[PDB]
Point group: C2
Chain length 62, copies 2
């Protein structure tokens, strides 16, 4: 039963570390996804802008 | 002379507007160069920002 206490405390100290690391991954995964959405909207702006300049030179061509 | 003046007036008007077209193109790339420059600095830094999150996420699990 005391060997269990050593084992239980070992996994408990690892489980609380697991809780800390998992949340940190959860914290960064959300921030990465929000910054991902920043990149997703990033091209959408210039994609609209690359093809508006793509069309604006058409009049300046002919 | 008048017949060539019509050509002269046409070529002068279209080129003086073509200079406007040229500068309109210059402002066209100015945003395009800036936005591409704005993206590539943002793209590279955010990718390694994700790798930084990815590394620590890998570090916590490995």
């Amino acid at each position: 039963i005391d060997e269990l206490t050593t084992r239980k405390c070992s996994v408990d100290a690892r489980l609380q570390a697991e809780n800390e690391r998992a949340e940190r991954q959860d914290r960064g995964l959300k921030e990465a996804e929000t910054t991902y959405a920043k990149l997703v909207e990033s091209q959408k702006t210039l994609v609209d802008f690359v093809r508006k300049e793509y069309e604006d030179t058409k009049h300046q061509k002919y």
